[PDB]
Amino acid sequence: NLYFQENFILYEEIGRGSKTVVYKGRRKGTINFVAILCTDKCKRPEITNWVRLTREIKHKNIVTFHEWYETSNHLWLVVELCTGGSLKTVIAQDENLPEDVVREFGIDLISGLHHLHKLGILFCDISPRKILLEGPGTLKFSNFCLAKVEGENLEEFFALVAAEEGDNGENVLKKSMKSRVKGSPVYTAPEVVRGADFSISSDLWSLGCLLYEMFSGKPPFFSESISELTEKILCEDPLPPIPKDSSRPKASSDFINLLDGLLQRDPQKRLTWTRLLQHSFWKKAFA
């Protein structure tokens, strides 16, 4: 059956996104609770992309796609429910995440990201707000609006979705397609900042930013100024990662070495997957 309200029950709102209200929901006649992203139709290109990239994926560290509905006034994206909060929230609430938690989180993210790359999918906007905790643990990549297939022109994809429909209503704002595929500058690899396409290697850079931030409480390159932020990313070695509270344990030499391989400005010098998986920080987790 094709009618959203005949298939799902809505409970409380649990979050907000761009042009999006997120609810806890349940498929009728089941005990399967889900997250329901209630979305303005203008977000159809982003939601189409998310579905087409993930619809056949089942992986512990990737939010599972279930259903996609359209009613008179909204799109409804039905995905796996994550109750543990975002990784951004965790980093903001838990001061000085211990290195062993950073390793476990790192193993979650590597396992999800390696799977995505093996499928030919780049996440492109790895960032703490786009990773959610399933419950007490398990990190999941949770937003695929800006993801794409390696080498794909996502701007052109979005324009094609828009063209075939035909969502704007009476809205007059003309938002460039380049604007819609734009991600978080804080986690953008330097070669992408200088104009190169996203790659497996630039995702690995962003992964290195995340691990750095998990341990130290702050991303390695940060400024409220977009031009200051770009100069930092392009020209400044990151400071050694220290816990915000200096009384807590320092980073191991293995952790430091891993971050040095991931935060290489030159992508040809950055760690590749095989070397990354074999790194001693993981303590043979990927043997």
Ligand SMILES: Nc1ncnc2c1ncn2[C@@H]1O[C@H](COP(=O)(O)OP(=O)(O)OP(O)(O)=S)[C@@H](O)[C@H]1O
């Ligand atoms: N699977 C899910 N389970 C539970 N809550 C979710 C789920 N997906 C999204 N949410 C909630 O909705 C919020 C949306 O966050 P984001 O993924 O950052 O979306 P957004 O703000 O629309 O991002 P962009 O950059 O604009 S596409 C999350 O922080 C959660 O509060």
